[PDB]
Amino acid sequence: PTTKPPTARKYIWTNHKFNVSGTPQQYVPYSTTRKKIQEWVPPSTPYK
Amino acid sequence: LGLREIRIHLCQRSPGSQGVRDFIEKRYVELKKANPDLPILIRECSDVQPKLWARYAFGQEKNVSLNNFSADQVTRTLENVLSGK
Amino acid sequence: GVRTSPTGEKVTHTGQAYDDGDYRRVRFSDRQKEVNENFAIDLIAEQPVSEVGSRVISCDGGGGALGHPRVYINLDKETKTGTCGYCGLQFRQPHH
Amino acid sequence: LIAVDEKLDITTLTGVPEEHIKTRKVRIFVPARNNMQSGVNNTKKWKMEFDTRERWENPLMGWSSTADPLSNLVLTFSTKEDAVAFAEKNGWSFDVEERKVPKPKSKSYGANFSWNKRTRVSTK
Amino acid sequence: NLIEVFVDGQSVMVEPGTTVLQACEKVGMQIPRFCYHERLSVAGNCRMCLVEIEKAPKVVAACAMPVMKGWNILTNSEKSKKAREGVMEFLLANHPLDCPICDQGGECDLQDQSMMFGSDRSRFLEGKRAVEDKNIGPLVKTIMTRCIQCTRCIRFASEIAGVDDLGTTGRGNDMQVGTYIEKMFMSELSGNIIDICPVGALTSKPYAFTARPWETRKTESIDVMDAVGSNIVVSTRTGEVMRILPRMHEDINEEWISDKTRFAYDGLKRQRLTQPMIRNEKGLLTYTTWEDALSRVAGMLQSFQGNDVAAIAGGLVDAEALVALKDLLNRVDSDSLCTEEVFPTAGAGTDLRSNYLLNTTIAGVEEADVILLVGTNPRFEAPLFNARIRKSWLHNDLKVALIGSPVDLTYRYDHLGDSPKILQDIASGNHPFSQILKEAKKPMVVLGSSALQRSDGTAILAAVSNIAQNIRLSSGVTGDWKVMNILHRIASQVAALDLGYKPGVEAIRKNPPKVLFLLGADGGCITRQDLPKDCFIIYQGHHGDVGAPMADVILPGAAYTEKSATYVNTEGRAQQTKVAVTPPGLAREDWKIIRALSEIAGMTLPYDTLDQVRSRLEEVSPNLVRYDDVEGANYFQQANELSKLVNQQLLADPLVPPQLTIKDFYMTDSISRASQTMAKCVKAVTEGI
Amino acid sequence: TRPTIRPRNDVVHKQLSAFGQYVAEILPKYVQQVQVSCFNELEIFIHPDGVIPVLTFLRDHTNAQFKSLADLTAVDVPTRQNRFEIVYNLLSLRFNSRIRVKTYTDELTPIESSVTVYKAANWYEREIWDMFGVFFANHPDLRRILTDYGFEGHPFRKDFPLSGYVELRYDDEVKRVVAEPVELAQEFRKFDLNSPWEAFPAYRQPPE
Amino acid sequence: TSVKPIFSRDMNEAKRRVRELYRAWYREVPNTVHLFQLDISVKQGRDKVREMFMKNAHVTDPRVVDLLVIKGKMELEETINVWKQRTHIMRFFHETEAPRPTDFLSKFYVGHDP
Ligand code: SF4
Ligand code: SF4
Numbered sequence A: 001p002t003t004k005p006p007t008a009r010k011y012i013w014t015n016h017k018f019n020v021s022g023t024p025q026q027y028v029p030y031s032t033t034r035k036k037i038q039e040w041v042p043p044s045t046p047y048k
Numbered sequence B: 001l002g003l004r005e006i007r008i009h010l011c012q013r014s015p016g017s018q019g020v021r022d023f024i025e026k027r028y029v030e031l032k033k034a035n036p037d038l039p040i041l042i043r044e045c046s047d048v049q050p051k052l053w054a055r056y057a058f059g060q061e062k063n064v065s066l067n068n069f070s071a072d073q074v075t076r077t078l079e080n081v082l083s084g085k
Numbered sequence C: 001g002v003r004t005s006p007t008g009e010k011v012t013h014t015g016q017a018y019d020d021g022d023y024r025r026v027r028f029s030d031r032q033k034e035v036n037e038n039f040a041i042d043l044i045a046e047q048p049v050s051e052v053g054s055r056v057i058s059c060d061g062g063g064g065a066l067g068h069p070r071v072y073i074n075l076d077k078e079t080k081t082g083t084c085g086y087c088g089l090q091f092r093q094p095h096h
Numbered sequence D: 001l002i003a004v005d006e007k008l009d010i011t012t013l014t015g016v017p018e019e020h021i022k023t024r025k026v027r028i029f030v031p032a033r034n035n036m037q038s039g040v041n042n043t044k045k046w047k048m049e050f051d052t053r054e055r056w057e058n059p060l061m062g063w064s065s066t067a068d069p070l071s072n073l074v075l076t077f078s079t080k081e082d083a084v085a086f087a088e089k090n091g092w093s094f095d096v097e098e099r100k101v102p103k104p105k106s107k108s109y110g111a112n113f114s115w116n117k118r119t120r121v122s123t124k
Numbered sequence E: 001n002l003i004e005v006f007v008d009g010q011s012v013m014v015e016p017g018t019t020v021l022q023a024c025e026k027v028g029m030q031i032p033r034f035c036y037h038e039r040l041s042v043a044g045n046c047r048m049c050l051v052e053i054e055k056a057p058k059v060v061a062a063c064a065m066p067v068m069k070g071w072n073i074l075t076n077s078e079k080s081k082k083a084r085e086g087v088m089e090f091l092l093a094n095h096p097l098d099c100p101i102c103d104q105g106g107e108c109d110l111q112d113q114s115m116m117f118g119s120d121r122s123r124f125l126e127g128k129r130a131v132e133d134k135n136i137g138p139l140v141k142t143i144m145t146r147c148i149q150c151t152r153c154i155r156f157a158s159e160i161a162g163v164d165d166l167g168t169t170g171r172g173n174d175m176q177v178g179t180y181i182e183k184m185f186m187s188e189l190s191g192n193i194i195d196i197c198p199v200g201a202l203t204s205k206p207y208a209f210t211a212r213p214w215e216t217r218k219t220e221s222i223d224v225m226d227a228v229g230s231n232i233v234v235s236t237r238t239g240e241v242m243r244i245l246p247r248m249h250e251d252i253n254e255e256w257i258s259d260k261t262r263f264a265y266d267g268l269k270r271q272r273l274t275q276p277m278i279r280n281e282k283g284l285l286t287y288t289t290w291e292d293a294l295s296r297v298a299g300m301l302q303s304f305q306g307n308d309v310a311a312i313a314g315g316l317v318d319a320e321a322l323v324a325l326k327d328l329l330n331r332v333d334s335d336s337l338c339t340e341e342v343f344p345t346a347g348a349g350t351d352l353r354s355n356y357l358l359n360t361t362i363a364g365v366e367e368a369d370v371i372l373l374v375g376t377n378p379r380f381e382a383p384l385f386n387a388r389i390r391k392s393w394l395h396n397d398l399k400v401a402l403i404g405s406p407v408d409l410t411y412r413y414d415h416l417g418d419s420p421k422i423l424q425d426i427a428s429g430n431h432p433f434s435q436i437l438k439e440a441k442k443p444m445v446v447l448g449s450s451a452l453q454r455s456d457g458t459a460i461l462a463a464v465s466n467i468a469q470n471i472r473l474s475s476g477v478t479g480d481w482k483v484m485n486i487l488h489r490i491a492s493q494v495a496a497l498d499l500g501y502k503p504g505v506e507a508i509r510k511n512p513p514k515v516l517f518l519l520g521a522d523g524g525c526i527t528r529q530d531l532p533k534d535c536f537i538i539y540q541g542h543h544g545d546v547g548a549p550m551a552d553v554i555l556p557g558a559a560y561t562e563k564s565a566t567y568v569n570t571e572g573r574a575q576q577t578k579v580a581v582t583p584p585g586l587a588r589e590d591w592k593i594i595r596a597l598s599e600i601a602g603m604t605l606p607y608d609t610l611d612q613v614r615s616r617l618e619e620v621s622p623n624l625v626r627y628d629d630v631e632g633a634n635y636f637q638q639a640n641e642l643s644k645l646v647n648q649q650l651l652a653d654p655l656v657p658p659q660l661t662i663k664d665f666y667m668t669d670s671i672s673r674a675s676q677t678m679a680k681c682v683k684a685v686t687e688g689i
Numbered sequence F: 001t002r003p004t005i006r007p008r009n010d011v012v013h014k015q016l017s018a019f020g021q022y023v024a025e026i027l028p029k030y031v032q033q034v035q036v037s038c039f040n041e042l043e044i045f046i047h048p049d050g051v052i053p054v055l056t057f058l059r060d061h062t063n064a065q066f067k068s069l070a071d072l073t074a075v076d077v078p079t080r081q082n083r084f085e086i087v088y089n090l091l092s093l094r095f096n097s098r099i100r101v102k103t104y105t106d107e108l109t110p111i112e113s114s115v116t117v118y119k120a121a122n123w124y125e126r127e128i129w130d131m132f133g134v135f136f137a138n139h140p141d142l143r144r145i146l147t148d149y150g151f152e153g154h155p156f157r158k159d160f161p162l163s164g165y166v167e168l169r170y171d172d173e174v175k176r177v178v179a180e181p182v183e184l185a186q187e188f189r190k191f192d193l194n195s196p197w198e199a200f201p202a203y204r205q206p207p208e
Numbered sequence G: 001t002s003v004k005p006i007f008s009r010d011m012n013e014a015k016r017r018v019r020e021l022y023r024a025w026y027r028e029v030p031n032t033v034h035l036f037q038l039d040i041s042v043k044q045g046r047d048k049v050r051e052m053f054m055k056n057a058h059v060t061d062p063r064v065v066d067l068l069v070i071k072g073k074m075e076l077e078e079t080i081n082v083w084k085q086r087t088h089i090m091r092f093f094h095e096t097e098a099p100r101p102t103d104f105l106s107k108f109y110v111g112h113d114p
């Protein structure tokens, strides 16, 4: 890398990271999609 | 005791429904005129025998076969249901 | 361009954020939630608009065979810029 | 060579659970042509498929889960009689849908320029 | 007589005037095509269907060339293969490299026919053509660089939809398809241009980028948005409804569906009822459990009985649910069973099916000579029926006459006033149209069921029955042709009438009930103002619109995409909807809810499974289990005789349809109101641009 | 030169056709059909009860010394009355040739075991029984070979689900591995791939 | 239509084979309980054998009966030879499966299953 530095981009991490398994910085998966079905919200005012 | 509705199931082409078909053709209007508020539903069967369902109060139903009947027989059987005997 | 939900949870670029009453937030306790800080929509908006003096231009994303399939954008509508939809790149004709 | 006056039935040999033998209604049908394409090569063989069951969302990663072994099972048959025979011998209930073929249509290019009829086209 | 032609040396007898393409179809060979659609006219400009005749030096356009006697059609000859390769080379020479970002993707005719009939390499070393994209509304997305100028959308627009706002401007390689102005192609039959476009130039905007054709699972069900009963295919993916597509049925649907059917599937993801709801001490709706909700409802059902129990059936209810609720209410001797739509019960009423059915089927319109529409707007009440009427008009010079408001249909018609006094004049014989009907060999009288909602619906029905009687007496008595017809606009109306529900809510208005079951009743016909104080309302349904806000107990049910059910369309045909996805949350099937309620209340119903419920349906009305059959018996004579004995006076009001404009078309039912795409369409057609 | 097209061997095609005629003449009682594919493979369709005579002839006859049983499998085709199609692949080292012999059977009809002609037929027929349910009459030891002990159902049949009906896990309460109904975290995503445009006209079937 | 019989010709010989197989299974349960160190009773094992025999009592085709007794002999020899483990023998008993409801109301409460 001293002889041939790599191409520099603004989105590339400035600080490298090792394997963070077994630490609070570990990766936890989740669903990245929103809720599929919207349920009806009943009126908050009384009736009858 | 309290009749609620009458249903007549007759196939439109089978020979066995010929008597029921004649009753519909030449006797239904007089029957309906006498019972304006009685639900008399005429429906269609495919390959089974004709039927006479009589729905009474509180969901009691009796089915009477009309297979190979005549127009007079259908009228008598129907008026027996209306009479109650 | 990360954003924070009212529950203190980061919002992903797809808008994902667990509800306040959602029980699934328990998985993040004593741990972290993986959110990428760079937002492609923000960066591509930050990109400028290239002005070319032709009715039709061609974009391959840069790099040639290392880009995307080459496509042609028609710069006739003067009320908006022509957008290459592979790379989201805007082009325009010199007005005035 | 023995003779049996019985209907063929292999449910006890297939190894299917009784739930999926009894409570399943397969559908024998010829698939409808996909309206997005004009080809008709997928509308030639009969298909047998099962009724849809529940699919829920996985709590982790949000994937679509299932508990029905026969959700992806689709069988191909050359004839309605063959499909019905297979369904009967395996014991599943079945609903048969008659094949729908387009009716022949009278097409004429010369009708686009009729002297007095409404078939004349205003554009080409 | 048939003439003998040969396809690859195989003999085949075809009628004179048959094209080469149809002869090859008869022998089982599908010739490649782009601009040919059997439902449209013959254009013959893409040149993809060129085939070689054995002795002809020149290839012929298979889609437009009629066959002659003793022709040998060489479908897979060297000349045919080279012609296909050349045409495909030109098309792909100018096409753009947009396949990965194209919604057509894996269901593209250009891709498939390129892979089957074209070459595998490109010789085009020049620059491509880029075309400016047009805007034609919120439903269709146009990326016109992908157009191959096949003129299918133009022919469809004009011929089928009666809208002449599509065409080609310019000439040469710069020829473009569009409106030439900022105009939105808004019509009730717009998505069919999305279907017929062979390339991705016209694509569905609500469906944009969501899925790919290979992922989706196809469920063959029917349509419930109107009373035509269109056959559809539901494209699901991971248990989610992704798309709605037409399914061919040449007697009902005929490959087309309306925009409401196609684009209102996204109302099934909003305002959904997912959990049972009761009312706490504050009077506010809160979630509860199935056991608790059904226990409260069954306690009320045990407390009250007789005519103090009513049920109102909505527009999206099915035969199984209807018969289960009917049996449950009959278990307590109650009979206040009603539908939220009015039909005249004077005379025959619902006793004879050939008094409220569309006796001349949809396919029977193509044979009629004269048609008279009374108090209806078929363009919005039944778009496919109106499309069939327009097709018959175009191809047979059918004479259409409309009595009442001059709505803008898609074809020229003879307008007759606005008032039923003209309807009485026609029956008397004073009107010239009486002579027209008498001289017509095949007349048809279609009375819109929206006209029967008036205070004088019985008088209108009697008048049109008298008109049909006069037609029958003057014209030929013999024949299987049927004149009298009724056009319905509600999916569940015919099934309810067959089961024995009393049409209209007049009985419930007459005798206010203590317990009211709103089974999908979102019309708002009966409200708490009419109901007595402290009336117990149970709304069972899938959308919270009106009945759910005003109800005491809320029971979530399943939609048509979510239950296997039976629906009867306006012509009396019965069709079964199949399950595509499952009900969300704690929602259940409607007849299952009713059966569980009966079991808790103690009046357990005699059916536990769908087959048993359909056996009960066969007991009440066997036509509900004879599915694809449409033939029935004709009792017009008895119906007319019963209608004559009681008559009233026609009101001095013009016949105004409920729907006069395309916005009124867009918003009609619960799913449509919950849909966001329908809201976008309404905004577009009101504010323009 | 046509570099992208497989060259054809008409000499071998003729030799295989001649030998097919030869065997069909020699064994008219059982042979129902003889075919030669265009990539030079001879295929013989026999009556199911001719397995032993046909195979013994093809092994012992001086002009057909098919001393090696290359393979033995079955194919499930539900649309047929006899769904199972038993295939024998034989290799003749003396004449440097290969032959195929195909018979048919259904669920309840046994096929005579060919362990008396070839010894590989033992495990091959055990596998056929295990995976398709086809029973072989005079088999020295017929039992499951590949499936789990007590496994119910024959997996390679077309009507058998891909994931089966049961799955295994260890249950701590009972301190042993248990079998429970199959339940998938992600359902197998079925893809409809077939194009609606006919690819090979040479194989087109009559419309009937 | 004459069909090739697997065994047993008519139904009586199939019933004879069924009785022989039942005796073989009945005399094997004590040895199976002893060898596999099962915690179940010998009476429980015999009852399970009886139940597994009774679920095929509706068969009227002698060939199907012959195939059933063939498979029964196979799974009996997997037990005498201790090829099976305690795992499979107890898989016969479904000791870990939760009891699925059978009445309409309970099935309605739990979910969408027919
Ligand atoms: S229309 Fe067809 S060929 Fe053109 S970009 Fe789309 S998928 Fe590709
Ligand atoms: S937009 Fe589509 S349907 Fe219209 S001419 Fe172009 S390719 Fe044909």
Ligand code: FES
Binding pocket: E032, E033, E034, E035, E036, E043, E044, E045, E046, E047, E048, E049, E050, E061, E062, E063, E064
């Ligand atoms: S399909 Fe015939 S020229 Fe287009």
Ligand SMILES: [Mg+2]
Binding pocket: E104, E193, E194, E195, E196, E197, E198, E199, E200, E201, E202, E203
């Ligand atoms: Mg399209």
Ligand SMILES: [Zn+2]
Binding pocket: C059, C060, C061, C068, C084, C085, C086, C087, C088, C089
């Ligand atoms: Zn680009």
